[PDB]
């Protein structure tokens, strides 16, 4: 298991524009296109993301290319963030995958708002971080996915994904 396989399980793959759990136009493997309610604004972000006239449909290769870029950008976002970087550097490799999953889902500003959980993760107080992470809109909106990520932070294993 690795971050790519983890996020493919949590995000799925759709080759045609769709609306994510929040109602936002999305394509591929969780590639958010726009928060705007306009489907034409989404298609136009799609053509620009891909470099051709898609008409709202992409192939598997293109979905995988977006995915690769997004994972890369989440990693680099973590490493440039003053709050996130010290936390990420303190973690083992499995639990690093969980941090990237959160950032991928909610952006770096989002995760950097989990101040209390971050501190408990840094101190390696796993059970206490799991409890604090669960007290969140994120957990209440997407509990199944949130539990998978929380368990990964809690145990340091891929069990929730196996
Ligand atoms: Cl892009
Ligand atoms: Cl979920």
DSSP run (H or E) holding 31:
strand 31-34
Ligand nearest to the backbone CA of 139: 2
CA of 75 to the centre of ligand 1 (A): 15
Residues 6+ apart with CB under 8 A from 155: 126
Question: Distance between CA atoms of 124 and 39, rounded to whole angstroms?
Answer: 44
* Cα–Cα distance, 28 to 104 (Å, whole number): 14
Catalytic residues: 11, 20
So where are the chain's domains? 1-162
1-162, what's its fold? Answer: Lysozyme (1.10.530)
CA of 147 to the centre of ligand 2 (A): 8
DSSP H or E segment with residue 17: strand 14-19
Asked if residue 161 lies in contact with residue 148, where contact means CB atoms within 8 angstroms, the answer is: yes
Nearest ligand to the CA atom of 20: 2
Structure determination technique employed: X-ray
State how far the Cα of 58 lies from the Cα of 138, in Å rounded to an integer: 29
Q: How far apart are CA 125 and CA 145, in angstroms?
A: 21
| Mutual angle of helices 93-112 and 115-122, in 10-degree steps | 160
Annotated binding site for substrate: 32, 104, 117, 132
């Amino acid at each position: 298991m690795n971050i790519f396989e983890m996020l493919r399980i949590d995000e799925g793959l759709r080759l045609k524009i769709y609306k994510d759990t929040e109602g936002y136009y999305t394509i591929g493997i969780g590639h958010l296109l726009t928060k705007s309610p306009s489907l034409n604004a989404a298609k136009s972000e799609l053509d620009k993301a891909i470099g051709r006239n898609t008409n709202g449909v992409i192939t598997k290769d293109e979905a995988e290319k977006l995915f690769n870029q997004d994972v890369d950008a989440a990693v680099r976002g973590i490493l440039r963030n003053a709050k996130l970087k010290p936390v990420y550097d303190s973690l083992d490799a499995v639990r690093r995958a969980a941090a990237i999953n959160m950032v991928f889902q909610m952006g770096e500003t989002g995760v950097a708002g989990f101040t209390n959980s971050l501190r408990m993760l840094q101190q390696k107080r796993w059970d206490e971080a799991a409890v604090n992470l669960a007290k969140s809109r994120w957990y209440n909106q997407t509990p199944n996915r949130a539990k998978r990520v929380i368990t990964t932070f809690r145990t340091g294993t891929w069990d929730a994904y196996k």
